[PDB]
Amino acid sequence: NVFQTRAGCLIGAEHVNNSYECDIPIGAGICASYQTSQSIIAYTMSLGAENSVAYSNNSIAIPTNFTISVTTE
Amino acid sequence: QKLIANQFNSAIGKIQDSLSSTASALGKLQDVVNQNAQALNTLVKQLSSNFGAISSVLNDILSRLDPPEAEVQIDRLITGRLQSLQTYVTQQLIRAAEIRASANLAATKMSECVLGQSKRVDFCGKGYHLMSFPQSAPHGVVFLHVTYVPAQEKNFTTAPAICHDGKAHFPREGVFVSNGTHWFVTQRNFYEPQIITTDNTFVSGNCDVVIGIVNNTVYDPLQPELDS
Amino acid sequence: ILPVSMTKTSVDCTMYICGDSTECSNLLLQYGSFCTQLNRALTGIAVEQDKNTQEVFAQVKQIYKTPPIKDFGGFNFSQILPDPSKPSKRSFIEDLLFNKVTMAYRFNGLTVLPPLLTDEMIAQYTSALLAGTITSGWTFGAGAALQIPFAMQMAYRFNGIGVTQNVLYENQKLIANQFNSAIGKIQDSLSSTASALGKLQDVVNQNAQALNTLVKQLSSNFGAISSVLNDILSRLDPPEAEVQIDRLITGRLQSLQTYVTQQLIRAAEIRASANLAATKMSECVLGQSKRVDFCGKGYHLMSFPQSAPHGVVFLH
Ligand SMILES: *[C@@H]1O[C@H](CO)[C@@H](O[C@@H]2O[C@H](CO)[C@@H](O)[C@H](O)[C@H]2NC(C)=O)[C@H](O)[C@H]1NC(C)=O
Ligand SMILES: *[C@@H]1O[C@H](CO)[C@@H](O[C@@H]2O[C@H](CO)[C@@H](O)[C@H](O)[C@H]2NC(C)=O)[C@H](O)[C@H]1NC(C)=O
Ligand SMILES: *[C@@H]1O[C@H](CO)[C@@H](O[C@@H]2O[C@H](CO)[C@@H](O)[C@H](O)[C@H]2NC(C)=O)[C@H](O)[C@H]1NC(C)=O
Ligand SMILES: *[C@@H]1O[C@H](CO)[C@@H](O[C@@H]2O[C@H](CO)[C@@H](O)[C@H](O)[C@H]2NC(C)=O)[C@H](O)[C@H]1NC(C)=O
Ligand SMILES: *[C@@H]1O[C@H](CO)[C@@H](O)[C@H](O)[C@H]1NC(C)=O
Ligand SMILES: *[C@@H]1O[C@H](CO)[C@@H](O)[C@H](O)[C@H]1NC(C)=O
Ligand SMILES: *[C@@H]1O[C@H](CO)[C@@H](O)[C@H](O)[C@H]1NC(C)=O
């Protein structure tokens, strides 16, 4: 099972038109992950999830509540 | 206060479960320890390489040959090993600076983040920063950044200004909002509506210039206080 | 203008040294782990290059996109926002940049690996970062983005620098024109002079520089009778040709460590420059900087990231 990429000739991973988070970085946006039986896949990495802020010149969103997170660095 | 306590205390508890099963979060440290022992290993293996000479054992070249030949061979040993040091050494210098570059980054976080409160954004991690707690780790340091992240939002109609008598009123701190009827001024990073009075707002200009000013009535603390 | 990543290269040590010759290839084994530790070295570079580009550009959890209709109060971002009519969507400015900056080395072994993130992706980040900066203020770096009227954003960014917000809303129209007319000249500043991008241009050159040098080292005798690895094998009986090929190998094998060490040192500079970007990107773009002349001369209001080849460009 062969597929042609931007980064070269890939073998043994079924192409996927869907696009998910980059998991195992390959090259030029192609990122592979294991999950679906199962087979290694290859797909164009989605950079981020998509959002569109709902914006209008009078529209403001002020947080009513908060969290306190402890992030190890 | 109480609600912030549990949010803090629980958020601590998550850390200890993270690191408990997490080998990767220390990858930065684990890599540094590795890469040294790596080049240290490779430095050692280079003692087993011929480098073109007839053997990699120093004496076994000697006792095989009469020394005036060994003087030639031991070159290709020395020329080899001496090089392999300068490779390893020049590595360490480069790698040392890399750590040196991360030491400044730590010694700055230690200074600014721990000992201060960092106005810098995302220097101490995502969210507005409250405090950090350093924790030692082998050949490294681990900060626990306590950061303030807002959560629940509510769409609000807002206005940059409010006419009263034709004067313009602007908030000292925060912004005029309304849920659609009553105009409230509130602080920015938390929703805490308050009725709009002169103590909330200062006067500047008049009603022509501002783009987006909206009619309203700014209540006066003082006026009722008079009426007796 | 800042460099961010440098061209990711990976060299085949056994081939680059010994072309198509087991005779030479066997000798290389007698130097041990040099061949392997070079790949271990260059991979360390090549890996973190896509870590640099990772740290800089993607600090944002989600990809925001500008609203369909642009009313910012008079500020015209069509210059800096993604161009909906280009096949690769990149803001009008970024095209000015990609024009300025610009199997040869692959024949030997120097294979130029593709950067993990395609340029079109880089332009989606710098769209997001720029989409959230415009609509959501600075809050999108601290959590969920919060839509706020852009003109009510700039009232804060004046309070940041100590100018009371009543200045803005009174001067808004004026400030609009000064902004727009300032953006325009950024085009010609880039359009009419090719030396502004020298920082990037220098990085790209020095990389392609050493590669040329590294290649030309193949043609040097290094004391051996010829620079063609086969000629030494063709003319001479091997027992002597062994000593000859050493001077080639010793020469070439050294000549890699020279090149490798340069890349390590040079990458360590980029690694430092990358953090400077990631620092600006976080503090300057995502927040508002109180650090005098860190974001560039003057009191700082906001910054607009723009991608450039193996680099990044901020509009302060
Ligand atoms: C702010 O959010 C916190 C949760 O993060 C809320 O606290 C929870 O409130 C519910 C009641 O609806 C309790 O059952 C939970 O035990 C509380 N959690 C904790 C950790 O104490 C809080 O009520 C929210 N406050 C506002 C004003 O929205
Ligand atoms: C917006 O918020 C204000 C402030 O609470 C609301 O005004 C109050 O609404 C409650 C409704 O339960 C009344 O009992 C109070 O008498 C109101 N007080 C004032 C000063 O108006 C208002 O109803 C809210 N409107 C919306 C659409 O949410
Ligand atoms: C705010 O209120 C003022 C009056 O308090 C409004 O002014 C009126 O504007 C219209 C539009 O031309 C005039 O025909 C009226 O004569 C004005 N009123 C007076 C008393 O002169 C103004 O339009 C309001 N604006 C907003 C945005 O609410
Ligand atoms: C923002 O500026 C661009 C150009 O900098 C404007 O696009 C121009 O629009 C006029 C329409 O009057 C055309 O005649 C020009 O040919 C356009 N130029 C380009 C390069 O597209 C755009 O209209 C401006 N928009 C805002 C909201 O200010
Ligand atoms: C993706 O969809 C196209 C049709 O648009 C199809 O030709 C292609 O085979 C699909 N890819 C995979 C991996 O199924
Ligand atoms: C604010 O309005 C937008 C409009 O699309 C909506 O998606 C969003 O959920 C609203 N905010 C909240 C807190 O529901
Ligand atoms: C805000 O935008 C709307 C368009 O949806 C327009 O009708 C209104 O006049 C604008 N108000 C201001 C203050 O710009």
Swiss-Prot record, chain B:
Residue segments, region Heptad repeat 1: 1-51
Annotated phenotype, changing T108I: In strain: Gamma/P.1
Glycosylation sites: N155, N179, N215
Effect of D31N: In strain: Delta/B.1.617.2, Mu/B.1.621
Bridged cysteine pairs (disulfide): C113-C124, C163-C207
Coiled coil location: 30-74
UniProt effect for mutating Q35H: In strain: Omicron/BA.1, Omicron/BA.2, Omicron/BA.2.12.1, Omicron/BA.2.75, Omicron/BA.4, Omicron/BA.5, Omicron/BQ.1.1, Omicron/XBB.1.5, Omicron/EG.5.1
Function per UniProt: Subunit of the fusion protein that is processed upon entry into the host cell. Mediates fusion of the virion and cellular membranes by functioning as a class I viral fusion protein. Contains a viral fusion peptide that is unmasked after S2 cleavage. This cleavage can occur at the cell membrane by host TMPRSS2 or during endocytosis by host CSTL. In either case, this triggers an extensive and irreversible conformational change that leads to fusion of the viral envelope with the cellular cytoplasmic membrane, releasing viral genomic RNA into the host cell cytoplasm.
Protein name (record): Spike protein S2'
Organism: Severe acute respiratory syndrome coronavirus 2
Taxonomic placement: Viruses, Riboviria, Orthornavirae, Pisuviricota, Pisoniviricetes
Swiss-Prot record, chain C:
Record note on what altering T279I does: In strain: Gamma/P.1
Annotated consequence of substituting N221K: In strain: Omicron/BA.1, Omicron/BA.2, Omicron/BA.2.12.1, Omicron/BA.2.75, Omicron/BA.4, Omicron/BA.5, Omicron/BQ.1.1, Omicron/XBB.1.5, Omicron/EG.5.1
Coiled-coil segments on the chain, per record: 201-245
Annotated site residues (Cleavage) in this chain: R90, S91
Renumbered residue ranges of the record's region Heptad repeat 1: 172-222
S-S bonds: C13-C35, C18-C24, C284-C295
Source domain of life: Viruses
Substitution effect: N39K: In strain: Omicron/BA.1, Omicron/BA.2, Omicron/BA.2.12.1, Omicron/BA.2.75, Omicron/BA.4, Omicron/BA.5, Omicron/BQ.1.1, Omicron/XBB.1.5, Omicron/EG.5.1
Effect of L233F: In strain: Omicron/BA.1
Function in brief: Precursor of the fusion protein processed in the biosynthesis of the S protein and the formation of virus particle. Mediates fusion of the virion and cellular membranes by functioning as a class I viral fusion protein. Contains two viral fusion peptides that are unmasked after cleavage. The S2/S2' cleavage occurs during virus entry at the cell membrane by host TMPRSS2 or during endocytosis by host CSTL.
Protein's recorded name: Spike protein S2
Source organism (scientific name): Severe acute respiratory syndrome coronavirus 2 (2019-nCoV)
Organism placement in taxonomy: Viruses, Riboviria, Orthornavirae, Pisuviricota, Pisoniviricetes
Designated gene of the protein: S
Section of the entire sequence shown: 726 to 1064 of 1273
